[PDB]
Amino acid sequence: RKQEVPLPAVGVAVTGIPAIERLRFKEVDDEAEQTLDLSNHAADLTQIGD
Amino acid sequence: SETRTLQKIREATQELLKYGLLEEASKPNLYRIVLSHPEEVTRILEPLDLDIGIDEIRGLLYVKVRLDETPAQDEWAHPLVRRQRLNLEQSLLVAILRQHFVAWEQESGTGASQAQIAIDDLLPQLQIYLGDPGSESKERTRLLTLLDQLKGHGLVTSPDAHERIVIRPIIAHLADPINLQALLAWLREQIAQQT
Amino acid sequence: SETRTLQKIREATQELLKYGLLEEASKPNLYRIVLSHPEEVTRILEPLDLDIGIDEIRGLLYVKVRLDETPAQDEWAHPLVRRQRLNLEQSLLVAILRQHFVAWEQESGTGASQAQIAIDDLLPQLQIYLGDPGSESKERTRLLTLLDQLKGHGLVTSPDAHERIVIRPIIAHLADPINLQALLAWLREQIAQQT
């Protein structure tokens, strides 16, 4: 199945020129930690309207 | 002071190199820009040992490896061309797609680029050659993998919501009767050897 | 019509574009061809908005975007160049290699010798910030995977028979060294914070 046929290269495309300047690097600046709101917020009946 | 190629020419040629081909029906302004200075773009590609082709009636410009002095062994060895060589499964799907494409072209000549087909039509064809693994989903995945590879070669649009695809006109110049006959001779040789 | 461009120059240009690089320590032929014929290659690259800088001291040549600095927008996007953003692991690795390379250049001057580092020194420094992935085998697997990917980006060579890599001089011309220094500051803060 994986044999290579002799068909000519047409519609050929070129890409991925390995320009060193194209490199960019990671961002981690959003380092603030939002701790858990695990506290029990169960309701207290005082609010209940008349 | 320093000479600079026309900005639009540079844009069009760089994009055309990026995508290896270009259709008037989808990006008309770049197509016409190239057609305004075909000598210029051919000149630009010349150092790369790359070249240009034209199909006015189909509105397609496609790059092609220059062969004036490159080794006849294979243009695929050319360093810049990135996507790897074609393989005979892809070639089988190419043959089926070419048949569908010529059938479409009969209906309205060259017409538009809208050579539409339903994926459910391809699976019956492949099942004959690649066989039947007995799981419709498995064969669908196999066909989609092959179609993805072909789209990597730029011969087919990616699937869509209606499970339809449209054959890129570039196929007419890969399945060129000359190429077809060269392949056919090679494959006849292969079978003869297979004994 | 047009006289064919010098074959040797076409080969040098296409090979250069295959790696965005040229090195006298590896390929003196194309290195010399380009060095003695810079105008031809630059003119060849003009149409695609491409240009080459050099460091003869390092024995290096490299490609670059010829677009004039901030022509219309602050940061540039180019059809034939894709700006990949290294994942944090790769960013850390490239940062450590960059600092090592500059340290080596301080030790021996500019371009006097290609920098080097062994796996022995490597693994501890990577585990300093990354920890244990689950085994030493996995440690070396990941290390070599990143090394191979960098070599694909041209930054490094693969380890030799003694597990020592060579830091490619290309490292001296990275795009945003300030971002690398900022991430290095964050890393050196986290190393102390977490211990």
C10 touches B at CB < 8 Å = yes
B83 touches C at CB < 8 Å = no
Where are any strands of DSSP class E within chain C? 21-23, 50-55, 60-65, 115-118, 164-167
Which H/E stretch holds residue B62? strand B60-65
For CA atoms B39, B40, B44, B45, give the dihedral sign. negative
> Could you tell me how far CA C139 lies from the centroid of its own chain?
23
Residues in chain C: 195
Residues just before a chain gap in chain C (C–N exceeding 2.5 Å) are: none
Q: List % helix, strand, coil for chain B (3-state, nearest 5).
A: 55, 15, 30
Neighbours of A9 (CB within 10 A): 22
> Coil, strand or helix: which one is C53?
strand
HSE-CB at C96 with a 13 A cutoff on CA atoms is 21
Contact B62, B21 (CB under 8 A): yes
How does strand B21-23 pair with strand C115-118? unpaired
For CA atoms B56, B60, B66, B71, give the dihedral sign. negative
Give how far Cα C121 sits from Cα of B116, C124, C151, C187, Å: 59, 6, 19, 18
Distance, in Å, from the CA atom of B147 to the CA atom of B156, rounded to the nearest integer, reads: 7
Q: Across the interface, do A19 and C91 touch by the CB < 8 Å criterion? A: no
Contacts of C162 (CB under 8 A, 6+ apart): C118
Q: Across the interface, do C10 and B47 touch by the CB < 8 Å criterion? A: yes
Distance, in Å, from the CA atom of B5 to the CA atom of C81, rounded to the nearest integer, reads: 19
Distance, in Å, from the CA atom of C36 to the CA atom of C40, rounded to the nearest integer, reads: 10
Dihedral through CA B146, CA B148, CA B154, CA B156, nearest 10?
80
Give how far Cα C45 sits from Cα of A25, B54, C184, Å: 27, 24, 35
Looking at residue C64, its amino acid is K
Which H/E stretch holds residue B191? helix B177-194
B69 touches C at CB < 8 Å = yes
CA nearest B179: which of B83, B117, B98, B70? B98
Distance, in Å, from the CA atom of B97 to the CA atom of B105, rounded to the nearest integer, reads: 12
Question: Which residues of chain A make contact with C49, given a CB cutoff of 8 A?
Answer: none
Nearest CA in chain B to C3: B46
Q: How far is A19 from chain B (nearest CA, A)?
A: 14
- Token pair recorded at residue C23: 């090195």
A30 touches C at CB < 8 Å = no
Contacts of C44 (CB under 8 A, 6+ apart): B47, C5, C9, C13
Cross-chain CB nearest to B63 (options A7, A12, A16): A12
Distance, in Å, from the CA atom of B35 to the CA atom of B42, rounded to the nearest integer, reads: 11
> Could you tell me how far CA A7 lies from the centroid of its own chain?
39
Q: Which chains touch A (3 or more CB pairs under 8 A)?
A: B, C
Distance, in Å, from the CA atom of C33 to the CA atom of C41, rounded to the nearest integer, reads: 10
Distance, in Å, from the CA atom of C80 to the CA atom of C84, rounded to the nearest integer, reads: 13
Say how many Å lie between the first and final Cα of chain A, rounded.
80
Phi, psi (degrees; rounded to nearest 5) at B131: 90, -170
Which H/E stretch holds residue B21? strand B21-23
> Could you tell me how far CA B136 lies from the centroid of its own chain?
28
> Coil, strand or helix: which one is C6?
coil
Distance, in Å, from the CA atom of B63 to the CA atom of B13, rounded to the nearest integer, reads: 10
Q: How far is B63 from chain A (nearest CA, A)?
A: 5
What Å resolution does this PDB entry report? Answer: 3.7
**Burial category of B46 from C-beta neighbours within 10 Å (exposed 0-12, middle 13-18, buried 19 and up):** buried
Distance, in Å, from the CA atom of A15 to the CA atom of B154, rounded to the nearest integer, reads: 13
Contact B194, B123 (CB under 8 A): no
Distance, in Å, from the CA atom of C12 to the CA atom of C29, rounded to the nearest integer, reads: 8
Selected residue of C2, C9, C10, C80 to mutate for chain B interface (largest B Cβ count, 10 A): C10
Question: Which residues of chain B make contact with C76, given a CB cutoff of 8 A?
Answer: none
- Token pair recorded at residue C136: 């030493």
Give how far Cα C59 sits from Cα of C22, C24, C146, C170, Å: 8, 5, 25, 10
DSSP C117-145: EEHHHHHHHHHHHH---SSHHHHHHHHHH
Distance, in Å, from the CA atom of B27 to the CA atom of B171, rounded to the nearest integer, reads: 18
CA nearest C66: which of B46, B17, B5? B5
